Design a protein around this ligand. Structure first.
Ligand SMILES: CC(C)CCC[C@@H](C)[C@H]1CC[C@H]2[C@@H]3CC=C4C[C@@H](O)CC[C@]4(C)[C@H]3CC[C@]12C
Ligand SMILES: CC(C)CCC[C@@H](C)[C@H]1CC[C@H]2[C@@H]3CC=C4C[C@@H](O)CC[C@]4(C)[C@H]3CC[C@]12C
Ligand SMILES: CCCCCCCC/C=C\CCCCCCCC(=O)OC[C@H](O)CO
Ligand SMILES: CCCCCCCC/C=C\CCCCCCCC(=O)OC[C@H](O)CO
Ligand SMILES: CCCCCCCC/C=C\CCCCCCCC(=O)OC[C@H](O)CO
Ligand SMILES: CCCCCCCC/C=C\CCCCCCCC(=O)OC[C@H](O)CO
Ligand SMILES: CCS(=O)(=O)N1CCC[C@@H]2CN3CCc4cc(OC)ccc4[C@H]3C[C@@H]21
Ligand SMILES: CCS(=O)(=O)N1CCC[C@@H]2CN3CCc4cc(OC)ccc4[C@H]3C[C@@H]21
Ligand SMILES: CCCCCCCC/C=C\CCCCCCCC(=O)O
Ligand SMILES: CCCCCCCC/C=C\CCCCCCCC(=O)O
Lengths: 474, 472
């Protein structure tokens, strides 16, 4: 028998902490599976990647972690040649699937914010099951289990070839880290530009005045009569916010007999040529109130809770905050079916015109007038309800994405010492070999990562916290 | 005579990573020093501890860290017997001073939490600078044994079984016990929720004109416009002081000035005062007694429509009603008791004496005198004084949190080594963690010196804003 490097005390001690770890990883991750499959707030199809990731951790804990310790403590591989090959393939496989899982999850967070409309109709359990199958096959192809292995008292070790060490470090850690970084870099640019609405500020917290009363007060303050009001804010530009589409549509409306029934409040100081076209229409028509001034947030909220409709005629609008904050106060949007406006507005919450054509806009303003004569009271409440529901949906999804970045960062920091050390040995071998005891500790920090995701979810997410509390405490 | 384990390449790579780490630790912690000694957000005296703790971590990077690595790579102590004793003495002192600093900070937050106002005036820069020396001295009485025990060409530390075990308890486990127990008391008073929800109680969240809001409110009650006074809370003799207001209304009702005034009194509980209020509501179609539980949003609307908020409290330690009322624009008429006397000044509101209805009726009659002219400046003084209190509490709330993280991170960094060193003292080669792993463990320890400026950037907005102001 080979002399062991571990005393009885060290064996009992190490088997106890690792024993503790295995149990902690299993119950925690089993609880994650349970939370996703039971919690209403967590039963979304994209959350199945977390179920699949939890299993990768449950199986390192049961199929790999005990043999890593037993092999260490014993100074030899006792479990036979067959289980050596299966143990080595899995160890690499389960490590590799966490890497590929974090790439799949990252992309899913990226496309949900960017391609919100198109992507979410593809966020189906069957489609998610297809991607989880794909991550597992990519993890098997990357891991390539058929050749990982290779004796008086036998040993169980990996292939020592240079091309292999490096191929496997890149495929299983360095390239998945490059993908995750790049995707999360693209997520934090979008998250910075598509900032969430001031939920508390954009609300009719007056609970004092009436809609028709606020409208009459507003239209008297500007210098008009009581009628169907239309309103524009934002930069005066042909390239994006599309003020030109509205000014041209008003020129089409002026030639009509229904122009007298309509009131228009245009705002912006973007283009000198467009400002002139705007104020010339204010000079030519008394139904037009052009305000080139910079109106404070306090003034625009007063405007939204008075005007019947808000015209958002953008060529490109990735978020459409103006639509959301306007809908919260009761203004019915008339927007171009572009980017973020296509996502927010429904049949019950507004009118979606085609971007660029003023004839498309003018015809909608006429349709708006036809709807105005009847009970607009219930149509305005669908706008208020949608704006809140969409905003709270996006705030909580923006939060879930952050938690998932924490999951990704903690994984990268847990495996970096090992992969950095294993890569160096692949390169300079002996001249840069991390000592045996440090190398061993480095892949144990790696194994410890399997127990961490359930702590991250608990700490950073209320829905997993509540699910865990409901199971654990009654 | 002996040659190192480290090849020419390793030496170069290791010197570059320790080299980088030393530079990172120095610039980062130097940035913490400048941040506390320049930013008005960090001009609170308690922050000076983080300048002394930044100084500790700079000295680690500069005076001990190059020698730890130099000694390692070289396989012996090249620098001589005198620098061996100073290097070892300092290396232990900077580790203990970090543990003791985190006992001084932990205990500072505890007195901040326990004795709220009396031991807040005590926190002075000259008082804190004395604690910084107290902690630096205590650190020496721990690092360098009072038993005038020796620390021990190699450069080893004293190997005696009892120096090993007493030193781990003194520099790590005892300060880890203090930190934990003190923060156990801290998070026990954190559940009080004594913080003003400024993310809600803000007149910015209200829409329309305040005059138009006060008109519509009175219109809902079917009342004519006039100087609207409000009382909020429960109906009881003591704490709230409903009995001081109902009796104060009786002095005013017997005067031609009551005509002008309007009352929105909100109380629930015992029918003794409730019957007295309802009778005054039946007697005067000018007073409106509300008993039912009112929504958090409707109170925000009342604070932002009514002219004055009456707080006739006998005992009021915090005075949140006043802070919530002030943040909405309402001018308070409150008794100068506990917290109210600490919030309301001469320019913000009207302070009185608890228990006298004649003094409160006189204050209500002074409120009516004031309302006849523009009150807008008083309200702008009300919001200004109350929001400065909410930011002072939030700055204290964050600071206590960011420092639970610093302490938590320090323990995780030193636990591997201090547990390893302790085990060794007990069972020696029977539980000796391997040479390389033991050496890495104290380098995890040395890495903690660069982490603190990263912890502040991430978790404290004031330091993040300060570091952006220095570096751009
Ligand atoms: C839930 C988590 C955070 C628990 C953490 C358990 C940690 C402390 C345990 C789990 C497995 C352990 C390792 C198992 C094997 C070895 C090899 C031996 O030659 C030195 C100790 C070392 C390197 C152990 C160090 C401590 C270790 C990493
Ligand atoms: C910017 C900061 C946070 C980077 C952190 C620096 C880390 C990675 C550095 C600092 C000092 C280094 C250690 C110095 C000494 C030894 C002992 C040797 O037998 C193995 C390598 C080992 C254990 C090094 C590993 C890496 C190390 C711990
Ligand atoms: C029969 C399978 C259908 C059950 C759907 C499910 O919720 O489970 C998916 C699985 O957890 C994904 O790894
Ligand atoms: C070796 C390993 C190679 C892995 C292959 C990599 C990527 C293919 C998977 C990406 C799937 C591409 C579809 C993109 C998508 O669905 O988003 C579009 C959006 O929803 C608007 O319709
Ligand atoms: C060897 C090359 C490294 C490949 C890295 C794997 C990235 C997998 C990402 C997405 C698949 C799921 C959609
Ligand atoms: C967490 C920090 C330390 C715990 C590690 C303590 C482990 C103590 C056992 C050390 C030991 O005796 O191990 C022999 C060595 O592995 C021969 O190569
Ligand atoms: C001490 C022998 S050993 O150092 O050779 N060894 C076999 C036992 C487990 C240990 C850690 N795990 C984590 C994942 C993983 C991923 C890889 O990328 C493909 C490559 C190896 C490792 C393995 C293998 C390690
Ligand atoms: C392997 C040599 S050694 O093990 O003997 N050694 C000398 C070099 C530094 C190393 C780490 N530092 C951190 C602070 C520190 C605090 C203590 O608590 C009082 C006790 C020792 C340590 C030292 C000493 C270590
Ligand atoms: C006073 C410290 C508190 C101890 C409990 C927490 C320790 C858990 C972390 C690492 C332990 C690793 C196992 C090392 C012990 C081996 C047993 C032995 O020494 O004989
Ligand atoms: C907070 C502590 C930081 C922990 C991160 C660990 C990352 C270090 C990883 C690998 C170290 C590489 C050193 C290789 C040179 C040593 C070779 C030799 O001993 O001859």
């Amino acid at each position: 028998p080979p002399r062991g490097q571990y005393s009885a005390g060290a064996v009992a001690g190490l088997a106890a902490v690792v024993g503790f770890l295995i149990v902690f990883t299993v119950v925690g991750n089993v609880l994650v599976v349970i939370a996703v499959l039971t919690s209403r707030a967590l039963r979304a199809p994209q959350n199945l990647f977390l179920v699949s990731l939890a299993s990768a951790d449950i199986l390192v804990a049961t199929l790999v972690m005990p043999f890593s310790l037993a092999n260490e403590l014993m100074a030899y591989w006792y479990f036979g040649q067959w289980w050596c090959g299966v143990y080595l393939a899995l160890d690499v496989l389960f490590c590799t699937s966490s890497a590929v899982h974090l790439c799949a999850i990252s992309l899913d967070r990226y496309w949900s914010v960017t391609q919100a409309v198109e992507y979410n109709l593809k966020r189906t359990p069957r489609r998610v099951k297809a991607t989880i199958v794909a991550v597992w096959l990519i993890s098997a192809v990357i891991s390539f289990p058929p050749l990982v292995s290779l004796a008086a008292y036998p040993q169980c070790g990996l292939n020592d070839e240079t091309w292999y060490i490096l191929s496997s470090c890149i495929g299983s850690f360095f390239a998945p880290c490059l993908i995750m970084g790049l995707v999360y870099a693209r997520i934090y640019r979008v998250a910075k530009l598509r900032t969430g609405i001031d939920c508390s500020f954009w609300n009719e917290s007056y609970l004092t005045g009436s809609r028709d009363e606020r409208k009459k007060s507003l239209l008297s303050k500007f210098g008009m009569d009581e009628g169907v009001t239309f309103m524009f804010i934002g930069r005066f530009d042909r390239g994006q916010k599309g003020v030109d589409v509205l000014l041209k549509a008003i020129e089409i409306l002026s030639s009509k007999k229904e122009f007298q029934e309509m009131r228009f409040i245009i705002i912006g100081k973007g283009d000198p040529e467009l400002e002139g076209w705007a104020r010339s229409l204010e000079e030519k028509h008394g139904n037009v109130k052009v305000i080139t001034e910079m109106l404070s947030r306090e003034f625009v909220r007063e405007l939204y809770g008075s005007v019947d409709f808000v015209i958002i005629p953008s060529y490109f609008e990735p978020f459409g905050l103006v639509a959301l904050e306007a809908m919260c106060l009761g203004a019915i949007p008339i927007a171009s079916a572009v980017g973020g406006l296509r996502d927010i507005i429904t049949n019950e919450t507004g009118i979606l015109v085609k971007a660029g054509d003023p004839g498309e806009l003018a015809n909608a303003i006429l349709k708006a007038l036809e709807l105005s004569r009847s009970d607009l009271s219930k149509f305005r409440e669908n706008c208020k309800k949608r704006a809140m529901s969409f905003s709270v949906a996006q705030a909580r999804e923006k939060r879930f994405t952050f938690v998932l970045a924490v999951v990704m960062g903690v994984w990268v920091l847990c495996w970096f010492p090992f992969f950095f050390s294993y890569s160096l040995y692949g390169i300079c071998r002996e001249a840069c070999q991390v000592p045996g005891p440090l190398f061993k500790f480095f892949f144990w920090i790696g194994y410890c990562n399997s127990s961490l995701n359930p702590v991250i979810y608990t700490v950073f997410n209320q829905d997993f916290r509540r699910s865990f509390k409901h199971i654990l405490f009654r």
